[PDB]
Structures are given as C-alpha cells and as structure tokens.
C-alpha cells in the first residue's frame, strides 16, 4: 500500500483518485491519500470549486518512485512531483499518517472495477502517448487535443494516439477497396494489431487510457479515440476469439462505471448502435448490449 | 460541400469537373419463376460520368458478365461505378484530370473516395439537385450501344451536339436538363415532340435534332409545357 501526500490544499477543490472524489476546503488540513493499492495504474485529478472547467490530472504507478501533490499559485493548480530522498518522503507521509491527516484510498474487497477498468493500461504506454519524459507521471486535462485532431496546434501538450482513420491508404489496400472498407480485418489484424501495437494488450491499453481520459476530464478526442477503437474491430468480420470475450468485458465496465448524466456527450449513438446491431460482432457482445439497453434504452 | 441552387453557376467556371451519375449501372428486369417465385434478370448497364462545361460525355458500358457468380449486387455496382469512374481519371492526362467530381446520389460518395484516396486534391461532392440523368437510357442512340454491347466498353460522345457553337454552357446545360426531365416525365410525348417535323433530321454524330435557334425556342416551350402538364396530373392541383 503507497501514499501520495500534498504539502497543503490552498484553494478550494474537488479531488478524485481513481472512480473516488472528496470535496475538499481552502486551506482544509489535507495532507494526501493513503492505502493506494498496488499492482495498477492510477489518477490524481482536481477541479478548483471556481473554475468547473478544466478538470486536469495526473496519471501514475507508485511502484516507479514517491510522490506528492503541491499547489503551485503562481500557475494556479496542484502539481505532481516526485521526491528523490527516500527517508525524507517515508518521514513526512508517516508523520502525516500519525496526524491522521489522510484519506484512506476507499477500496471495497468485492470491487474489481479499478481493476477491470485498467486492466491492459501499463504505465509506460500511457507516458508515449504523453510524452514528458523529465516525469515519470503524466499530466491530461480537458482541453489537451489529440495528435489525429492536430492534423484537421502545440505538440508538446498533444496526445499521441494511434491514428485511425477508415478512409486512409493506410487501411485500404489498392485492389480490396470495396473489400477492406465492408471488412476491416485486414486493418484491424495486420495494419494495427501486428504492425503497430504488436499485441491486443496493448491495443485494448489504449482504448481503456482513451475511454479513462474521456471519461475523468471530458476530452473530446480522447472519446473520439476509444469509440473510433471499438469501432475497428466491431467492423471486422474476423476477431481472435478471446478478443472479442474480453471487449464485452471492457466496454461493460466502462459503461457501467460511466456517470448517468454524461451518457449524451460520452456515447456516440452512430458507432453503439452499429456495433451492437449492424455489425460483424452485433451477437458477440451480450453482456455490453445488455448493460447498455437496460441503462441507455434512448439512445439506442 | 455540396452542389445546390446557389452555387450553381460553378459547373460552367473553368474548373474541370465531372458529374457521375449510376442510376442506370445495375439494371434488372423482374419475373416469375416456373415455381411462382419472382428472381431478377440482369441487363447492361451504364455509368454516366458529363462534363457539364464541354458536354463531352464519358458512357462506361457495364456488361451484365460483371456481375456474374456476385452477391449484393446493389451495393457492389456503386463500387464498380467508383472503380471505372477512378480508372476513367488515372487515365486521363494531368491537365485533364477533373478537380470536382459529382455525384447524384450520395450513396456513391464513400465508394468513389476510397478508390480515388490516391488523388487527395480532387474533391468528391454530393448535390441537393435532383438531377435527371437517370433519362440518359430513353436516347435511343445511347440506349442502343448500352444493349448491343458484348462486353465492356467505354464510348465517347459529346451530349450537347454542335450547341456550344452558338450558345454558352450555361444554356446549354439547361437545355440538356430540360430535354432529360421531360424524357423522364413522359417519353412518349417528349419523343413525339422531337420528331413532329420529319424535316429535322438527326446528323449521324449527333443525338439531338439539327433544329435552328428559333425551332429550339418552340421546342423547349413544348418541353417546358409537357413537364407542368404533368406535375397537375400527378398531384392533382
Ligand atoms: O437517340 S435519340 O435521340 N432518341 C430519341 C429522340 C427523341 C427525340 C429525338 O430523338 C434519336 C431518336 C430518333 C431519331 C434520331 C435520334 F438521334
């Protein structure tokens, strides 16, 4: 079990690590979160009680080095740093814990969900689709746009996603136009599975990081992403079978874990109502389809 | 984006564009089986890709060998369409390449853009006219080396005639569409129209009648006529 602590909560914030989020005082003695389970990623993210737009974060994994939050009131937000003096940082979370001034990371035993939200999302992915390699810990916000969003402007504070796009030389082959279009398994399997993300850990990594970022800081592109993953192999005619059992696993705790009232931005009916009923895995994805029609009959 | 009333003046600018039409692609009569059942037959088909500036008309006889042993045949015509329309600009020289390409009906958009991704700077647009292209097959003329086709074939005609002679694009243009709504309309009478008068011959290298600037003037009154006559019949106002 590992600590974050913070120096000090100056302003008035909400704080959420991980699906949990306290509501927390200007100058409120907290000093940071204790209990934080190891063996997964995590994240640290605030909105300021003043301003309810952008939500921003801190993606992280205790077991790469400490770390603790401190606000920064010359560039207005809690900061995410990592303290090098291993007795200085065990000093000061013991003495917090004694002042009993932490929350408690509010796990239940039965609860998987973190787990299962984040069961492919390995912390050296997610720092090359945030490049800022001086941190071992990664910083999103609301606003931050993807790298496929830049083509349609600063590249330090982009979002490298895997690029995907349907209507591409990329995932067309010359010769299999109509082909590749209707069935894209040759894009899907070869292009992007092989080639690209070696792996499907690693692809369905990205899609939970994308559906996460979605989902805790409402960025746009990051929602364009998941859906635009799903998509791809809800659209090819031929899926690797256990690929296809642990989609309906994904999806299903992302939409059971989704806020009831974000349904209407978070959810592209063009692309569920497809997946769920037009498409090759239309009868492949039972436990998904039934959380989302009992849950979101409308949209569909 | 897409081609409508108001922007209509930049079919006839000197930007090379083409408009595609694929009503008459995949074409079926429908009958009775021996045991009641109904199946189709499939007869030749074409691919109408004009030039609204020049009139020079580009009729990619389809030939019903292409759809032999296929399924979803609907669907696979308007890639066809995109396939033989992209190969029509591949093979064409540069400076002749269009900018623009057209097309009537919005289904064939995706289709022809994936198989032109090779020609990123040619923009592939869908029009909210209501084009009468699908008429192109009541021209004898055409109609005739559709059918007679043994295989595929593309044929190279210029659908205005001589008219560019005498009259600009634009009226040209207008022309061809008035002719093609009335075809549309009815057949019966617009052909009756055009022929009245056996004295107006048809040149061997032309599908319209060799009237003159005042016989045009009549016969597209007439043209104009037929087509409001028969709006009251449908609707019954
Ligand atoms: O191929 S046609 O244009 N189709 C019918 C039509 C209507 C009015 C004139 O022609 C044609 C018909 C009859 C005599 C010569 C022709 F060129």
Redesign the interface.
């Given at each position: 079990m590992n600590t974050v602590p913070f120096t000090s909560a100056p302003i008035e914030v909400t704080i959420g690590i991980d699906q949990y989020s306290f509501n927390v005082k200007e100058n409120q003695p907290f000093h940071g979160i204790k209990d934080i389970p190891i063996g997964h990623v995590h994240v640290i993210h605030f909105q300021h009680a003043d301003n309810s737009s952008m939500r921003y974060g801190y993606w992280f994994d205790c077991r790469m080095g400490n770390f603790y939050i401190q606000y920064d009131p010359k560039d207005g937000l809690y900061k995410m740093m990592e303290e090098r003096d291993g007795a200085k940082f065990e000093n000061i979370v013991h003495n917090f814990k004694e002042r009993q001034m932490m929350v408690s990371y509010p796990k239940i035993d039965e609860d998987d969900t973190w787990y299962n939200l984040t069961e492919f999302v390995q912390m050296d992915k997610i720092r090359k689709i945030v490049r800022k390699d001086e941190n071992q810990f990664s910083y999103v916000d609301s606003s931050m746009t993807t790298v496929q969003e830049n083509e349609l402007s600063d590249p330090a504070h982009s979002l490298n996603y895997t690029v995907i796009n349907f209507?591409?030389?990329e995932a067309?082959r010359?010769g299999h136009?109509?082909e590749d279009?209707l069935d894209k398994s040759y894009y899907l399997n070869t292009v992007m599975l092989q080639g690209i993300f070696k792996n499907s850990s690693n692809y369905f990594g990205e899609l939970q990081f994308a559906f996460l970022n979605a989902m805790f800081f409402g960025n746009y592109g990051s929602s364009l992403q998941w859906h635009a993953m799903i998509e791809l192999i809800c659209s090819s005619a031929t899926v690797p079978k256990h690929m296809l059992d642990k989609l309906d696993e994904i999806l299903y705790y992302q939409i059971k874990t989704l806020p009831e009232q974000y349904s209407d931005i978070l959810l592209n009916e063009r692309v569920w109502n497809i997946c769920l009923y037009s498409s090759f895995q239309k009868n492949s994805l039972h436990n998904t389809e039934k959380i989302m029609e009992n849950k979101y009959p409308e949209l569909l | 984006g897409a081609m409508n009333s108001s922007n209509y003046a930049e079919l006839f600018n000197n930007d090379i564009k083409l408009f595609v039409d694929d009503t008459n692609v995949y074409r079926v009569t429908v009958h009775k089986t021996f045991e009641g059942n109904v199946a189709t037959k499939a007869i030749n088909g074409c691919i109408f890709t004009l030039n609204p500036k020049t009139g020079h008309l580009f009729l990619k006889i389809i030939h019903t060998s292409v759809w032999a042993g296929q399924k979803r045949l609907s669907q696979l015509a308007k890639w066809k369409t995109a396939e033989e329309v992209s190969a029509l600009v591949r093979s064409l020289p540069k400076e002749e390449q269009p900018k623009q390409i057209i097309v009537t009906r919005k289904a064939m958009l995706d289709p022809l853009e994936v198989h032109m991704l090779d020609f990123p700077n040619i923009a592939i647009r869908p029009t909210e006219l209501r084009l009468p292209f699908s008429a192109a097959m009541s021209i004898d003329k055409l109609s005739d080396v559709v059918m007679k086709a043994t295989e595929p074939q593309m044929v190279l005609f210029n659908i205005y005639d001589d008219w560019l002679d005498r009259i600009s694009s634009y009226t040209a243009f207008s022309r061809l569409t008035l002719l093609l709504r009335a075809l549309k309309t009815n057949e019966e009478s617009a052909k009756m129209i055009l022929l009245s008068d056996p004295t107006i011959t048809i040149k061997s290298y032309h599908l319209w009648p060799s009237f003159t600037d005042e016989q045009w003037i009549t016969i597209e009154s007439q043209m104009r006529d037929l087509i409001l006559t028969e709006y009251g019949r449908k609707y019954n106002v």
């Open positions: 209507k591409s030389r067309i010359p136009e109509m279009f | -």
